[PDB]
Symmetry: C3
Subunit: 531 residues, 3 copies
């Protein structure tokens, strides 16, 4: 008999599903609206509250993913999904929905911890439905909420002023959190213990929320997986007006004033703005053209509502709610997936110094390394060997450090020094669910931890006992953090706290504490970037 | 000698005077008074908003446009229903939320006359207020007659089945008009405390629905449904309306990703575009081939949660709704000629044999909703009686008529009676002389025939016999007496029994007299049949 | 260091500009929004408050001029600008801006008198940027504010009823005055002493505002230069519906109803409405067709909001907050500029009684003289001689008396008879900045006083000592009126109050007082029009 819950705006009908072995069924709700569809005049404006509905709303089918490149979008979904078969998704501007997976007995009044997931995809692609919360829900007895937010132009078009401040996608995330606060108890969730976690752009979002005074009170714990507010490619610093003009022109709009641009873009069709998106060619390494002018994506800006100053200035301000914060990275963040997605010219599998330097310059939009610093950086990472293959790999290590390693550690340190409980980890394992095209030597590639965190071993086939073991351990760690703000618990390897000693957990076949993660690196980059 | 100027809440309005043979006091007529904000652009598919107030004097002297509809079908129905000498041609427009007022009072005085608000019919698809001239009824009965318009078809009833487009926009328009009457009618010499809503067909269904709506409680004090009620299933959509909404969206060239998307896309179509979409859907017409259960005759009333919280069938038994005197009536031959002729029925031969009868009844599913299995019983019960092919054709017409109006009307009346409210019923049997030449002379009490008596056609049109004039005078008296007392009885009229347990009704025609248990058998049969 | 002011809606950044002769630099803020951009659903509706902004708004570039005939607008801008080089402008519907010139030292607290300028252009063209308030502000130590308001179809389209009452352009002027009341103090101005002044359509706007209850208490002193509410060509009386339908059809809109028309027009792009504007051929003399049907422009209407009754009815009504009002005219208002802009058939420089009567009839939309009265009028002016060249010049003084001369005197008389301080003046000078295509005999042509009032001599090149001193005198007269409601001051010739003696100031090479301005003319016309 279909589970029915009363939300603030009306009743919703879900479905029961059982995970082999668990007696307690899991109540699943799909496509619950947490805001009014941002259509027509609502485009490029803050999300507004959803209109209440009368009878019972069937929440039993996957919501559309926000408008995005269908090729790249379907591709990322197939790569990150933890469910047996990838589900086809529709595209729409009407995408402000969230999915709920609750193991609570709805006939009673449960108050289980809530874990809100924020997907990645560079703020350009991605969807909530990609991640099935069944296993994590059943296995750790927590409520899992997958949320969506506007992407690309729709979610981040900014004119740098009041006519289109920006960060709509982040405001969308804040709206979902507020929705959780007002409705989660009805789904056996405890609104007083909400944990936000997400990877890549989702991790950067978590990081942004953590620094935003607007979101303060909507969550109690946070987890950033391979992505923080200091992952520069995701945060636009400076004048965002030129980008706005570039988009407006591409879409066939006048650029007389900001209001004109926004009004014009508001009158273009969804399908028309998708074409402008394809023309801009985001998430792709531009091989010709001043690298200092390529915009790999539209992102987070300093709008004056969500963020009042740069992420950097906000940290040194020790001004932000201090909640337990887990920040982690993977051994090889730029190992395969990202270079593959952006079409890096690494067809050869080799790289010599001069070519690495040229590549590093081309990669400017991702690492922002001034042309005069290239020799020092490249020399520091590749100079130690003559093996052209190892240079290519160390080259990939160089990128990962500037985009994820150093930023993540710098963030953790500031959170820590601010007085709040902090924890770090470095995932190093090669999931069997990896793509067939990914070289077998890549271990701990971007996104690899998603399979352990979301229990892919229990939803997909072929997991060895070792993989199944790693997954369970990881879910208990995440869930333990969810309830106590401390990942530790009986039967799990000790996870030291990230204090001045900087201990962190190395996760993989062998999991054990260690210290001073990326210490030399942070020293090298903070110093180089100072010049 | 000087046009009448009335001050309303929203502004001053200027009407004109019109005299009628037999009355000294000219009637003040005001045409096209706005009672809502024009439902254009973003307002399409949303409740009606209050009209903007205006400065100076608004000229209410020309007929307003009629809501977008099939211009051809709309002119035809208007010509067969109009009570004036010559039918008045109308323009089409989305800007159509207007009402016409005909007051017999002297506006230099303080009159407080009973008000009668008319709701035209036309299957919620076509129709207009201007079709009906209240001049005669207003003068002859000293009552204020108000004819209202409301959004039709797609504009008035498009429903996605959920919050993005609940539907019933046309019904909400009717409510908005009644609300307007309550705040302004006193300036026209009317009594806001004595408003009677009446209408026939879809108009009768509207009235019936308003009686069951918590949204209209306290906006009217008496109701009259003529040939149409909430149980006239063809006008009430029961089930999942999502599929129809999608068939409409696709026919208009819209995506159907979600409801919000459908509504957003339809809101951007032009009136001509939505009009073409209307024509392609072929509403108000019987489809001869394919599956009958899938053919959609029109967009109608739905259970939205605002206007109607449950199905009419449920709301009646609830004994939960402000009770007001209610008059429910029907004509002797509802499916006699007009409806079949309009919906283009395959009765071109005048003859019908059992086999052909059972097929026709199955094809008429959207009109009579009878499971293909029940067909035999229903057909035998009506046609089995004889072997004359022509007589079978007639008995078939009485079959359709009892399913669409006859029985529902009596059920609605019984439940209203059992709910503890004053109920009255009638059965009109007369062949107006204003009838169309293409109408078989054997047809008496066709659909819409009482409209000529009620609106006093004999006093506007030409050639009425003293017999027809007298039927009209009697009916207007009964209607107006009901308007002012909730009881049609008064001096100079045959006794109209109340519809109590004895179920006595009034037979109106050349010879008007009381009778009892109208359609008692039919109700029994059909209730028993639909009980499968 | 750039000046930064705090306004209700946010901080604005300007720039300092020094003027030869004054130590204190003048702070100039360009393009400050005073209303929300009137786009989309806001077209043909009252102006709305501007959306507040975060951070610092850079008010340092000229704002667009409201959509208009770009060829006519640039021409008028050039002929009227007081700066050396005319500044080319961009077109936009996003034009509700104002420019501020404050000579106050924003570090201290100043309460300087404020002068708000309302440009002209027949309500069809014009811009605020054309006028530089640098000279006036610095020389007379007042805060100068130039504003903009919707023009043509955008600012005056009227269906004659509630669906589109009209006078949007006038409602904009009122919104800019409220802005001043709420923000001017931050710029060193005194909201308690605001003087509104303008010329031509700007003159008529000021006149209208003096009669409107929507504007009472938004200003304390008024100055109408060559334009008043009785200047027939700018005020539409009677059924305006015909013009509305004519515009709708020209734009390809059904005329079914008022609401339907306005709705259709609201869906037209700026380009489409501009094309309609051009086809309508406004501000141009129509040679062919019934003069009683030609419509030179879209103008002020009796909407029931801004104006409850016609200007004539409101004057004798003695019902309108009284303020010191100054009404003036130029010696030859129809000398060159206007006939040139409207393309008058005066290609021969001569005119015979017959041709004269033809034009006077064709000129109906401007003078409104019934065909039967043409003889009595042409005879009065031209009948004095036989000289065709002398006749052509009298014909011009005939048009000028009807359009500006008479109307002005009457307005001033009624204002006076209502107990309000009144002042009149006749400008009789030929600025050296005149156009080359302008006949050298023309003295005191339309807009000639502008160069004196805005101190053109201190911005442009080649002004003789005579012209420089004239401008200095005019600015003091104007500024004294601004601070006192009386133009007189030490060193300036005596300016009599326009009382029963009807004294006025003749301004030019020799500035002196005189009496009964246009007395004969008024008498003659009042009497004629009575027929
Ligand atoms: O992508 C083509 C092809 O290139 C190889 C080397 O032959 O891998 C390179 O490119 C990958 C991303 O596209 C990197 O992850 C990898 O490290 C680099 O050597 C092949 O493995 C791949 O099939
Ligand atoms: O001109 C009308 C004509 O139609 C006929 C035959 O087609 O009547 C049939 O159809 C009518 C409606 O279209 C029905 O009312 C009628 O009962 C049916 O026999 C002729 O009988 C009539 O003269
Ligand atoms: O451009 C027309 C041309 O006409 C002349 C005489 O040839 O002047 C007449 O027309 C002017 C309108 O442009 C009037 O202002 C002027 O008063 C009239 O004599 C030339 O001066 C002028 O270039
Ligand atoms: C047309 C469509 O596909 N939308 C789905 C909707 C909502 O969109 C839910 O929120 C799921 O997204 O739910 C339904 O089941 C429902 O309410 O009857 C219909 C359909 O399954
Ligand atoms: C003065 C006024 O506002 N009334 C106008 C009416 C209104 O639309 C009424 O609502 C419908 O009679 O319609 C006209 O405009 C029209 O085009 O025939 C004429 C009239 O001037
Ligand atoms: C984009 C541009 O170059 N125009 C300028 C506009 C102006 O306000 C108006 O468009 C014209 O006055 O916006 C600014 O003021 C601003 O908000 O920082 C500065 C900007 O340089
Ligand atoms: C929602 O569920 C009800 C009953 O389970 C069903 O009638 C309805 O059609 C469903 N929604 C859809 C797919 O239309
Ligand atoms: C029609 O309305 C107009 C208002 O524009 C009014 O002047 C006129 O008198 C009305 N028609 C008549 C002749 O009554
Ligand atoms: C305003 O801020 C600075 C100060 O002059 C200026 O350089 C910048 O261009 C302006 N802001 C914008 C629109 O970038
Ligand atoms: P993430 C997978 O959401 O985005 C990447 C970090 C990027 C390099 C910006 C595409
Ligand atoms: P009414 C004549 O307005 O409409 C009929 C009842 C229908 C069958 C729906 C056409
Ligand atoms: P003003 C120069 O703004 O406009 C003139 C008075 C006109 C004659 C209408 C062009």
């Amino acid at each position: 008999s279909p589970p029915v819950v009363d939300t603030v705006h009306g009743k919703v009908l879900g479905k029961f599903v059982s995970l082999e072995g668990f007696a307690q069924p899991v109540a699943i709700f799909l496509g619950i609206p947490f805001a009014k569809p941002p259509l027509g005049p609502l485009r490029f404006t803050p999300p507004q509250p959803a209109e209440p509905w009368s009878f019972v709303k069937n929440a039993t089918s996957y919501p559309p993913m926000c408008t995005q490149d269908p090729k790249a979008g379907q591709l990322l979904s197939e790569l990150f999904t933890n469910r047996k078969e990838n589900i086809p998704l529709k595209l729409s501007e009407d995408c402000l929905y969230l999915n709920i997976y609750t193991p609570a007995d709805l006939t009673k009044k449960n108050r289980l911890p809530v874990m809100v997931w924020i997907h990645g995809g560079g703020l350009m692609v991605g969807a909530a439905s990609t991640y099935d919360g069944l296993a994590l829900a059943a296995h750790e007895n927590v409520v899992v909420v997958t949320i969506q937010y506007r992407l690309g132009i729709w979610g981040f078009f900014s004119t740098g002023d009041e006519h289109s401040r920006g960060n709509w996608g982040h405001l969308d995330q804040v709206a979902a959190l507020r929705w959780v606060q007002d409705n989660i108890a009805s789904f056996g969730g405890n609104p007083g213990s909400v944990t936000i976690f997400g990877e890549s752009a989702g991790g950067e979002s978590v990081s942004v929320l953590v620094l935003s005074p607007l979101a303060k009170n909507l969550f109690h714990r946070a987890i950033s997986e391979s992505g923080v507010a200091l992952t520069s490619v995701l945060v636009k610093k400076g004048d965002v007006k030129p980008l706005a003009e570039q988009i407006a022109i591409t879409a066939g709009c006048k650029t007389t004033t900001s209001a004109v641009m926004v009004h014009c873009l508001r009158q273009k069709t969804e399908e028309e703005l998708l074409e402008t998106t394809l023309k801009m060619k985001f998430l792709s390494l531009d091989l010709q053209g001043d690298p200092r002018e390529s915009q790999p994506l539209l992102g987070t800006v300093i709008d004056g509502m969500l963020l009042l100053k740069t992420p950097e200035e906000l940290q040194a301000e020790r001004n932000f709610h201090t909640v337990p914060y887990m920040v982690g990275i993977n051994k090889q963040e730029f190992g395969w997936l990202i270079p593959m997605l952006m079409s890096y010219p690494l067809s050869e599998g080799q790289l010599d110094q001069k070519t690495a330097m040229s590549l590093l310059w081309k990669s400017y939009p991702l690492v922002c390394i001034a042309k005069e610093l290239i020799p020092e950086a490249t020399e520091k990472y590749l100079g130690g060997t003559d093996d052209t293959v190892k240079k290519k790999d160390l080259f990939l290590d160089l990128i990962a450090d500037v985009m994820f390693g150093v930023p993540s550690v710098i963030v953790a340190r500031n959170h820590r020094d601010a007085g709040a409980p902090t924890y770090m980890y470095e995932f190093q394992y090669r999931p069997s669910f990896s793509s067939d095209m990914k070289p077998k030597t890549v271990i701990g590639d971007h996104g690899d931890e998603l399979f352990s965190v979301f229990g892919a071993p229990f939803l997909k086939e072929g997991a060895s006992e070792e993989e199944i073991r790693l997954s369970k351990m990881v879910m208990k760690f995440w869930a333990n953090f969810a309830r106590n703000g401390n990942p530790n618990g009986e039967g799990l390897p000790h996870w030291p706290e990230y204090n001045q000693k900087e201990g962190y957990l190395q996760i993989g076949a062998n999991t054990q504490a260690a210290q001073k993660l990326k210490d030399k690196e942070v020293a090298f980059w903070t110093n180089l970037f100072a010049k």
